[PDB]
Amino acid sequence: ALAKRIDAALIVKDGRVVEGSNFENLRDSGDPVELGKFYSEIGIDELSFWDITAVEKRKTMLELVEKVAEQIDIPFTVGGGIHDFETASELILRGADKVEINTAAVENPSLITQIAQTFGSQAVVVYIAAKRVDGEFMVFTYSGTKNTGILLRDWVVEVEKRGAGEIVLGSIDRLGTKSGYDTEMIRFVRPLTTLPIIAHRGAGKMEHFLEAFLAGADAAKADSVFHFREIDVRELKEYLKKHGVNVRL
Numbered sequence: 001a002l003a004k005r006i007d008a009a010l011i012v013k014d015g016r017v018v019e020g021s022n023f024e025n026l027r028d029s030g031d032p033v034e035l036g037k038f039y040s041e042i043g044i045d046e047l048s049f050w051d052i053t054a055v056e057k058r059k060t061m062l063e064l065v066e067k068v069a070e071q072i073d074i075p076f077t078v079g080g081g082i083h084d085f086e087t088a089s090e091l092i093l094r095g096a097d098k099v100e101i102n103t104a105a106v107e108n109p110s111l112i113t114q115i116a117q118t119f120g121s122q123a124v125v126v127y128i129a130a131k132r133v134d135g136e137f138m139v140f141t142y143s144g145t146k147n148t149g150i151l152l153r154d155w156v157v158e159v160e161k162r163g164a165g166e167i168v169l170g171s172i173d174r175l176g177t178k179s180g181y182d183t184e185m186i187r188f189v190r191p192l193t194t195l196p197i198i199a200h201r202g203a204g205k206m207e208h209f210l211e212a213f214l215a216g217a218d219a220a221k222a223d224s225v226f227h228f229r230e231i232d233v234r235e236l237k238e239y240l241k242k243h244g245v246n247v248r249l
Contacts, residue, residue: 051081079125082099089119130172153189
């Protein structure tokens with residue numbers, strides 16, 4: 001098999017973890033590099049960093065990927081406000097395994113192609129934020145707030161065609177919610193693409209992850225459930241492996 005992956009997402013701003021973590025065993029529980037590193041040691045397969053720095057942003061983001069590339073041994077993705085090829089190229093550049101684009105991809109899909117052909121499809125992740133609108137899955141930009149009018153089913157196909165290597169599927173309705181991943185959305189998207197699917201939004205308990213993997217997800221991304229210690233990563237992996245999921249352990 002293919003191993004299923006568990007991803008920790010970190011939101012960062014000015015080199016800090018926005019809202020920190022409860023890993024007080026750490027020297028600075030709000031340091032993304034030390035927190036990233038610590039997750040890699042306890043059983044997280046990949047890391048994700050989303051930057052919301054002010055402009056200050058480029059230097060901040062470059063310093064982040066430099067310090068992470070040097071310290072951590074697992075794959076990592078860096079996003080966003082990465083609006084052009086040059087910024088993307090430079091971050092990959094500086095040590096990021098992948099760049100994640102969302103609003104930029106929708107507004108410039110050719111941006112997927114450009115990074116893909118210079119660095120390979122494996123270097124490009126497109127975050128799709130989607131929401132049911134009148135019985136239809138629609139793609140949304142600007143953190144889930146702007147209805148683009150594009151069907152999920154069409155963007156998924158287009159994203160693939162342009163050469164993305166992987167897709168985050170984030171259920172806007174589940175933002176903040178704790179009651180499971182949107183497995184019906186996962187199951188909708190699964191037969192449309194052979195790209196890897198990373199589920200995002202909704203995780204509350206270990207069983208949620210088993211459900212998303214049944215749904216066809218190749219990876220499951222979570223953040224605050226991990227940071228706040230609601231779910232222990234080791235315990236999550238031992239639970240998945242006990243119920244037949246092919247996880248890293």
